[PDB]
């Protein structure tokens, strides 16, 4: 993948919006780029709700290493499109824009695909209640006096 930093994600988002690309004769300011990186950090932090949200592998920058741009985002290869399409949707209003229908649809699809595997992982069944017997067909448990399920 040719998108390997937070600024790379931001550049992909701007190109997707059609504001700035490698072919355009006019470009956006580095301050606007840093603002877009702040937006990206905020969006990913709101997704990853301290571990109880969308798990992606994103790495949050620290103040010790100064530029958040330039840091590898750490996403797997299949989260980049979702991340930068959602980023384009989020940062469109700054430039008096409105993301096109295709961008919005790809953002929805990408976010759902991002959360699919985590949803499958969290679809877990609870253990038996503490008041449920283990039956008598469980000869080992009933010989060891496990007449009722442990629970918890």
């Amino acid at each position: 993948m040719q998108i390997k930093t937070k600024g790379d994600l931001v550049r992909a988002a701007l190109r997707k919006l059609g504001v700035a690309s490698d072919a355009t004769l006019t470009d956006v300011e580095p301050q606007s780029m840093q603002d877009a990186v702040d937006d990206l950090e905020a969006m990913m932090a709101e997704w990853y709700q301290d571990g109880k949200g969308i798990i992606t592998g994103y790495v949050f920058s620290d103040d010790e290493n100064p530029p958040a741009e330039g840091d590898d985002h750490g996403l797997r290869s299949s989260a980049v499109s979702a991340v930068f399409h959602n980023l384009a949707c989020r940062i469109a209003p700054d430039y008096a824009l409105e993301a096109t229908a295709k961008i919005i649809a790809t953002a929805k699809y990408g976010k759902e695909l991002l959360y699919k595997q985590t949803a499958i992982s969290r679809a877990k069944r609870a253990p038996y209640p503490s008041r449920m017997p283990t039956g008598s067909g469980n000869s080992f448990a009933n010989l060891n006096e496990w007449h009722y399920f442990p629970g918890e």
Partner: protein, 45 residues
């Protein structure tokens, strides 16, 4: 050669042999005599 050793060998053999039916019988006694909620091993909070 020891009287106690032979006695205890016999007792240990018999106890181990009867260990299953005895356990089931005492469980039946407790179930029908003390309480049918015999879940002393389940840790409920």
């Amino acid at each position: 050669e020891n009287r106690l050793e032979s006695i205890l060998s016999r007792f240990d053999a018999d106890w181990t042999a009867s260990d299953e039916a005895r356990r089931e019988a005492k469980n039946d006694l407790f179930f029908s005599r003390v309480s049918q909620w015999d879940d002393w091993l389940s840790q409920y909070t």
